[PDB]
């Protein structure tokens, strides 16, 4: 394994270089539309993001060491969490708004519960002054942790070793930022506790997506549908 022999800086360097781009939406301001249209736009976007997420996940240290079936499981469980943490990250310096795309910026006044929870998370990230290096670590943690309890033959032991490595990397980052040992542990705990809210938001969001599907007005792509059946 290569991932188990990366130094903290090498870990960060790899994750940073593996970052997916920020895709645009169609939006069209001239279009006046709706709740249907907006969800239609977000569905299009998510579907194109998923292709980059898959190729990004391959560059996450340790992911390719897993079997093909294990890769499938981890992504099926975590895809919306990962999309959502990306969303709140790029929404940090846009208080009271969500930047789904550089041309798609939404405020509250137009699912409000999901909106408010996404806002609360982005605001939480801003107060903490979350760093890009810390963000990419958290995102990788989500990919590896969310499906590890839902899978002899054989490991997951390996997954935990890489998770521990990412933990090491996080702490290393906080050390270089001039934090005390007490501050390092406290910040670490704060970051991981937010992963619990992100799971909550993903769960609630999955419910709506399942409603949307059965009330066949907002069409899902073939890939998004397959990802939806996974959370049966």
């Amino acid at each position: 394994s290569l991932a188990l022999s990366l130094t903290a800086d090498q870990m960060v360097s790899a994750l940073l270089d593996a970052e997916p781009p920020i895709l645009y939406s169609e939006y069209d301001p001239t279009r006046p539309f709706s709740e249907a249209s907006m969800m239609g736009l977000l569905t299009n976007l998510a579907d194109r993001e998923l292709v980059h997420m898959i190729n990004w996940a391959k560059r996450v240290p340790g992911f390719v060491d897993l079997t093909l079936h294990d890769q499938v499981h981890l992504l099926e469980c975590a895809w919306l969490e990962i999309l959502m943490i990306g969303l709140v990250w790029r929404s940090m310096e846009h208080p009271g708004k969500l930047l789904f795309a550089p041309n798609l910026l939404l405020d509250r006044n137009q699912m409000v519960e999901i909106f408010d929870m996404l806002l609360a998370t982005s605001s939480r990230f801003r107060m903490m002054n979350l760093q890009g290096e810390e963000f990419v670590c958290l995102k990788s943690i989500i990919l590896l942790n969310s499906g590890v309890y839902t899978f002899s033959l054989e490991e997951k032991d390996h997954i935990h070793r890489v998770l521990d490595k990412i933990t090491d990397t996080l702490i290393h980052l906080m050390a270089k930022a001039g934090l005390t040992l007490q501050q390092q542990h406290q910040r670490l705990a704060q970051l991981l506790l937010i992963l619990s809210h992100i799971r909550h938001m993903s769960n609630k969001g999955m419910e709506h997506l399942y409603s949307m599907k059965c009330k066949n007005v907002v069409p899902l792509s073939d890939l998004l549908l397959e990802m939806l059946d996974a959370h049966r």
Binding site: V51, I54, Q71, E226, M227
Partner: peptide, 9 residues
């Protein structure tokens, strides 16, 4: 599975 396909180049 589309996801499985994409994961192998």
């Amino acid at each position: 599975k589309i996801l499985h396909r994409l994961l192998q180049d």
